[PDB]
């Protein structure tokens, strides 16, 4: 199912974002 | 039960990139 | 008015990055 | 119709973090 | 189709985020 690779994929990128923000901070 | 997953993703992104850019300003 | 919200969100996305691009130079 | 304007948007955000990543570099 | 770019386009945010993780870690 392409529409669940997405979910999948933009939750990572959420996980991905709080590790950045953890880094900047 | 997909697309409203990606806006409640893309709500918590753009959360996250304003925590990001208010960061970097200081 | 399903995808129209993830469009708003990507618009929100591109401006956002953006003006991280600017604020790092 | 706005699902090229998503891929148009994406587009937009993979430059803007290739961007992002040449300023951390 | 188009979904099939998104997903490519999720796929390459995720490994440019893997980068800015990388170079801030």
């Keep these: 199912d392409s529409q669940?690779?997405?979910v999948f994929?933009?939750?990572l990128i959420?996980?991905?974002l709080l590790?950045?923000?953890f880094?900047?901070?």
Excluded: D, G, M
Aim: charged letters at 15%; a positive charge.
């Design 23 to 25: 880094l900047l901070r």
């Design 19 to 21: 590790a950045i923000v």
């Design 9 to 11: 994929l933009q939750f």
């Design 14 to 16: 959420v996980l991905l």
């Design 4 to 6: 669940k690779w997405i």
